[PDB]
């Protein structure tokens, strides 16, 4: 009830970044967040594989036992750092304060406004990038169904907001590039959603090594089996079907939507794809960071 007035409102702004309206008040809780050096941060631009990687990290920390991961929804097992629902739930930061190490922290903040404490404590960051076209489709449908978001209107107007960085958490170009560069000064494992669709066990292995964990071949196969898109769409612990429909309208668009690489071809018009590609080449000039739009 109290949170209703924050739902479906236009973006606020925190440190020059568009922010979910409900998340923006009381932002000192984020700026002053107290990290621990053993914290694992799962950082992504929205709709780039946060839930996927979070479940993989949790599974690795439980020794590859999928039963352990069903003790709670992924939204509670891996709290989102900046999440808040004023008057309805405790913030993500308050939940994380009461969580035993090793904490898994999910966040969508760009690198330059991720809380300083994370950088000073050298916390291991697992970043996931996804090609901007699939992200924009996924983010558009997410906004149609997630009532925390300002309504996206039509797809063509949303896409224009997306390319301009006028969506929640700002420019995708600055986001993916910010963490790609910050790895020169911080332990960052930079993953690619498309690499995970192509070869999931290979990417789980890289996450396990980064976390200093050793997996038997059985544990690895068990983690690959339960972190398929099909395993996670039907798992109530990962598919967000436990979120009340008042906050996430699962009928409009399910959270576990398509889970593929290349869905952008079913939504980008011929003209949209031409304009997006020129702007993308302009905006992604001068970086060695490369994304794949098909595999
Ligand atoms: N195990 C998995 N395999 C593939 N895609 C997955 C996945 N788990 C989630 N996804 C996809 O990742 C996106 C959500 O990313 P995030 O967790 O950061 O919000 C959605 O993309 P789609 O909307 O294209 O289906 C969702 O379907």
């Amino acid at each position: 009830a109290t949170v209703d007035r924050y739902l479906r409102q236009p973006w606020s702004v925190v440190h020059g970044i568009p922010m979910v309206c409900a998340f923006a008040p009381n932002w000192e809780r984020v700026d002053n967040f107290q990290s621990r050096p053993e914290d694992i941060v799962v950082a992504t631009f929205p709709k780039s594989g946060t839930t996927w990687v979070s479940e993989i990290v949790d599974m690795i920390l439980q020794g590859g036992d999928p039963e352990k991961c069903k003790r709670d929804a992924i939204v509670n097992r891996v709290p989102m750092l900046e999440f808040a629902a004023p008057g309805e739930m405790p913030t993500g930061s308050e939940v994380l304060a009461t969580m035993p190490s090793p904490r898994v922290v999910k966040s969508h903040l760009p690198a330059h406004i991720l809380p300083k404490s994370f950088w000073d404590n050298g916390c291991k960051i697992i970043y996931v990038g996804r090609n901007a076209k699939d992200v924009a489709v996924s983010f558009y449908h997410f906004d149609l169904m997630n009532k925390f978001e300002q309504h996206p209107g039509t797809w063509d107007q949303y896409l224009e907001a997306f390319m301009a960085g006028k969506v929640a958490y700002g420019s995708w170009f600055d986001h993916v590039r910010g963490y790609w560069e910050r790895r020169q000064e911080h332990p960052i494992l930079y993953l690619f959603y498309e690499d995970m669709k192509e070869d999931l066990r290979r990417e789980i292995t890289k996450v396990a090594q980064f976390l200093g964990q050793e997996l038997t071949e059985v544990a690895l196969d068990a983690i690959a089996h339960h972190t398929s898109f099909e395993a996670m769409r039907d798992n109530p612990s990962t598919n967000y079907s436990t979120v009340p429909s008042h906050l996430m309208d699962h009928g409009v668009s399910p959270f576990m939507r398509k889970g593929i690489t290349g869905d952008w071809k079913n939504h980008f018009t011929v003209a949209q794809n031409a304009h997006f590609d020129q702007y993308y080449a302009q905006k992604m000039a001068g970086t060695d960071l490369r994304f794949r739009t098909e595999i």
Side-chain angles (χ1 to χ4, degrees):
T2 289
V3 72
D4 291 328
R5 63 166 141 120
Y6 296 97
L7 308 181
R8 279 284 187 238
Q9 299 280 4
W11 314 125
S12 303
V13 181
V14 311
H15 303 302
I17 296 302
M19 195 27 71
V20 179
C21 172
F23 298 177
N26 193 24
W27 195 259
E28 64 274 5
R29 94 199 173 270
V30 170
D31 284 335
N32 299 339
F33 182 78
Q34 279 139 228
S35 75
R36 316 168 193 160
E38 43 284 24
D39 285 347
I40 303 158
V41 178
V42 178
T44 64
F45 189 84
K47 316 317 294 166
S48 302
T50 325
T51 306
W52 197 0
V53 177
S54 298
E55 179 75 354
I56 294 167
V57 171
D58 197 45
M59 274 256 273
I60 286 161
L61 297 181
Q62 315 297 327
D65 177 23
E67 270 333 279
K68 308 270 207 154
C69 293
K70 288 143 181 163
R71 92 265 192 184
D72 209 346
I74 193 48
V75 85
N76 300 126
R77 294 180 284 128
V78 183
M80 181 197 293
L81 163 76
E82 65 268 12
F83 173 86
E88 162 148 62
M89 335 198 60
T91 73
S93 62
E94 296 160 6
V95 177
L96 283 161
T98 75
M99 285 222 335
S101 302
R103 291 192 299 191
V104 192
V105 186
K106 135 176 191 202
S107 178
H108 301 305
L109 301 173
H112 66 292
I113 76 167
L114 192 72
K116 153 222 82 63
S117 173
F118 285 112
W119 306 109
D120 291 353
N121 277 358
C123 306
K124 286 195 284 334
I125 299 175
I126 300 175
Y127 188 85
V128 198
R130 184 180 191 190
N131 83 80
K133 295 198 236 194
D134 284 334
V135 165
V137 168
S138 180
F139 211 175
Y140 175 68
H141 287 93
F142 182 71
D143 277 19
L144 283 178
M145 74 74 91
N146 192 304
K147 299 306 204 106
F148 283 92
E149 306 288 88
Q150 141 194 326
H151 194 274
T154 66
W155 158 243
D156 181 77
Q157 290 290 293
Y158 180 79
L159 184 58
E160 220 72 73
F162 181 89
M163 315 174 51
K166 307 305 190 176
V167 298
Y169 297 94
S171 168
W172 174 96
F173 307 96
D174 298 348
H175 208 290
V176 296
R177 271 178 317 171
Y179 279 93
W180 181 250
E181 294 166 2
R182 284 279 219 131
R183 84 183 198 271
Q184 309 280 120
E185 308 151 358
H186 194 93
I188 296 181
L189 171 63
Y190 202 107
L191 299 181
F192 293 85
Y193 177 101
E194 291 75 14
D195 293 358
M196 276 152 97
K197 301 282 316 170
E198 187 181 63
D199 189 337
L200 180 49
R201 291 127 304 288
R202 144 186 91 182
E203 308 301 318
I204 296 152
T205 303
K206 289 161 40 164
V207 168
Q209 293 155 166
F210 189 59
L211 299 190
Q213 305 284 306
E214 281 154 287
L215 305 173
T216 69
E217 226 74 8
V218 188
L220 174 79
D221 296 304
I223 294 175
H225 172 261
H226 273 77
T227 58
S228 83
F229 172 77
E230 299 72 31
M232 274 177 87
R233 179 201 47 211
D234 305 322
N235 181 1
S237 208
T238 60
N239 66 7
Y240 284 84
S241 65
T242 65
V243 172
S245 214
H246 166 238
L247 308 178
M248 289 183 55
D249 189 341
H250 316 276
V252 170
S253 185
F255 189 95
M256 289 308 176
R257 199 177 57 82
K258 270 206 194 94
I260 68 153
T261 291
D263 193 38
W264 62 269
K265 301 166 135 138
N266 301 308
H267 296 90
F268 276 75
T269 65
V270 170
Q272 281 168 349
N273 194 57
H275 173 216
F276 187 98
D277 282 345
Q278 306 166 71
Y279 187 64
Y280 183 97
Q282 278 191 17
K283 197 86 207 268
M284 288 306 273
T287 185
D288 54 340
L289 173 62
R290 289 318 210 272
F291 292 85
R292 293 188 289 170
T293 55
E294 38 208 68
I295 61 185

